[PDB]
Amino acid sequence: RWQQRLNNYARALQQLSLAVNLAQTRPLSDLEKQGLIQAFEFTHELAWNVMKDYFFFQGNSAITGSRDATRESFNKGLIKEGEIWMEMIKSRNQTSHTYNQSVADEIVKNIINFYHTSFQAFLEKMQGLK
Amino acid sequence: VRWQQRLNNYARALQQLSLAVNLAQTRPLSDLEKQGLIQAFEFTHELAWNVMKDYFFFQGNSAITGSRDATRESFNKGLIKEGEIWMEMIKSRNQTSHTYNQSVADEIVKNIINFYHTSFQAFLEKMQGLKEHE
Amino acid sequence: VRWQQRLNNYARALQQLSLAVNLAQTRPLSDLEKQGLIQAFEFTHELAWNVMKDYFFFQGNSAITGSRDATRESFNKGLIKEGEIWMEMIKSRNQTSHTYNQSVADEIVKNIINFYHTSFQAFLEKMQGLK
Amino acid sequence: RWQQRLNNYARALQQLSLAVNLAQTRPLSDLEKQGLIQAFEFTHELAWNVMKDYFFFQGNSAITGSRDATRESFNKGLIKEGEIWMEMIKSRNQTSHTYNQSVADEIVKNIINFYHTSFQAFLEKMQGLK
Numbered sequence: 001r002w003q004q005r006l007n008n009y010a011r012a013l014q015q016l017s018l019a020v021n022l023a024q025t026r027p028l029s030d031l032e033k034q035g036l037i038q039a040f041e042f043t044h045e046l047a048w049n050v051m052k053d054y055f056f057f058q059g060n061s062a063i064t065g066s067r068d069a070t071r072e073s074f075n076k077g078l079i080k081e082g083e084i085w086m087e088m089i090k091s092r093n094q095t096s097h098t099y100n101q102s103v104a105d106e107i108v109k110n111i112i113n114f115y116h117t118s119f120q121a122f123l124e125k126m127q128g129l130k
Numbered sequence: 131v132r133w134q135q136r137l138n139n140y141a142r143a144l145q146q147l148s149l150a151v152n153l154a155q156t157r158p159l160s161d162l163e164k165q166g167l168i169q170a171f172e173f174t175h176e177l178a179w180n181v182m183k184d185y186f187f188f189q190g191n192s193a194i195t196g197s198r199d200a201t202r203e204s205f206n207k208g209l210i211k212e213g214e215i216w217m218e219m220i221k222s223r224n225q226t227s228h229t230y231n232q233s234v235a236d237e238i239v240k241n242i243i244n245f246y247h248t249s250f251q252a253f254l255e256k257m258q259g260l261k262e263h264e
Numbered sequence: 265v266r267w268q269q270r271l272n273n274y275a276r277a278l279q280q281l282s283l284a285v286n287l288a289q290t291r292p293l294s295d296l297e298k299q300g301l302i303q304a305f306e307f308t309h310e311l312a313w314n315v316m317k318d319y320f321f322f323q324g325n326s327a328i329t330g331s332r333d334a335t336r337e338s339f340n341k342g343l344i345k346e347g348e349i350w351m352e353m354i355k356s357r358n359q360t361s362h363t364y365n366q367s368v369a370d371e372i373v374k375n376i377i378n379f380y381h382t383s384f385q386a387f388l389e390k391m392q393g394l395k
Numbered sequence: 396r397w398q399q400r401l402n403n404y405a406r407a408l409q410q411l412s413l414a415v416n417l418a419q420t421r422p423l424s425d426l427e428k429q430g431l432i433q434a435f436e437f438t439h440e441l442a443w444n445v446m447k448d449y450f451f452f453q454g455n456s457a458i459t460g461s462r463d464a465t466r467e468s469f470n471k472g473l474i475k476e477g478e479i480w481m482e483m484i485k486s487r488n489q490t491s492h493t494y495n496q497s498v499a500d501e502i503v504k505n506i507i508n509f510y511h512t513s514f515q516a517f518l519e520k521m522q523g524l525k
């Protein structure tokens with residue numbers, strides 16, 4: 001059920017948002033930065049599964065993974081910022097290298113400056129769809 | 131030597147994980163800090179099993195397709211002692227997407243603190259010794 | 265006009281499905297022919313709901329995201345009468361990866377022959393009349 | 396469980412192989428060609444899910460779709476003909492057009508001439524891994 005996936009996406013995003021707000025109030029420790037990255041990862045995993053579950057509900061069983069799901073979501077208007085959602089997939093592919101502080105800082109910057117807003121917009125869109 | 135350069139990166143990663151583990155031994159971690167400990171586990175484990183894959187490729191074994199194969203061959207050859215613990219690490223890796231549930235995050239953290247950190251350190255010392263002698 | 269080009273291909277697809285459906289009324293299909301009937305249902309259904317999407321888009325509706333949306337709007341606007349049958353089509357589409365199981369292949373084939381074929385034929389007449 | 400997925404892949408492939416041998420015996424009807432295409436669809440869907448399940452079993456939960464499962468299988472030596480498997484994905488993307496006889500014939504040709512032998516090699520490799 002795509003609505004159950006959406007409810008879990010909402011929960012995960014709530015945790016990500018608490019971390020983003022914290023980072024707004026003060027600098028994050030190195031450990032907290034790693035945690036923000038992990039929350040981004042479980043929120044994005046939920047998001048593209050919401051996409052795939054929703055298109056399955058619509059009758060599209062051809063979508064396989066996150067790139068398929070993101071491309072169909074952009075094509076059908078579930079997301080507007082196709083570029084940012086593609087960048088998220090690239091960021092996920094960098095996860096194993098965040099023990100380098102430059103990589104961690106770059107991913108954190110993208111999460112705060114771009115991904116959180118896009119996650120919130122996708123939540124609002126999918127909630128409006130049911 | 132490829133496996134030795136990987137090991138240098140593994141050692142760096144593990145130093146970061148160890149900082150977080152000893153802090154966790156000191157006080158409760160926040161939810162966000164637990165997520166960070168899990169992330170550090172993930173990059174440390176990824177490096178560890180690739181050290182093993184590199185090492186066994188250097189030794190002539192090209193039948194390692196992932197962390198399970200690498201762990202099995204390492205336990206077969208004695209690079210690791212605690213087979214069950216290293217297998218459980220793979221289960222923990224596969225739970226990463228569910229750590230927005232507090233019970234899942236708490237269980238991975240518990241396993242990192244009680245078992246995985248020790249195994250990571252033992253494996254580092256083992257491979258450091260293998261730079262010098264069988 | 266995009267939707268009429270889609271309709272023209274839908275007609276060609278439905279003609280091929282009809283051949284197989286009328287053959288199945290004649291005799292048992294081989295296991296392979298059953299798979300072929302399912303494939304023709306797949307390409308005929310895919311054209312059908314994209315005809316609906318293209319048509320409503322040509323009337324100014326850009327809110328259709330998939331075959332379920334397209335079916336609902338077609339029912340609301342009278343392009344189909346058998347809303348529940350068209351809804352079952354979507355369930356059938358979502359099962360085609362499992363037609364290596366005979367229970368699944370036979371269920372889909374039965375629905376194609378007993379229900380979907382006539383629904384496809386009605387939709388053809390409706391949209392050719394709007395053409 | 397990747398072993399259960401492999402068992403289902405073996406059953407699906409057995410049906411595809413029956414169709415390929417029948418084609419060796421005599422020309423296929425248009426409907427029978429459509430059936431060979433459907434068998435290719437359910438066999439390939441199972442195959443790339445066998446890859447994904449196996450890498451999950453290995454501890455890699457980053458694979459999401461058919462493309463990255465296929466790339467990872469080539470990288471880890473599970474398949475030797477990476478480009479044929481990538482072509483398989485493109486053929487999947489064309490199956491909605493097999494109401495045109497030219498498309499149907501091209502896909503059938505690739506199934507008989509290339510995909511079947513690759514499917515069999517992958518089955519043998521994965522069964523060897525047990």
Ligand SMILES: [Mg+2]
Pocket residue numbers: 037038041095168169172226
């Ligand atoms: Mg992570």
Ligand SMILES: [Mg+2]
Pocket residue numbers: 302303306360432433436490
């Ligand atoms: Mg098909």
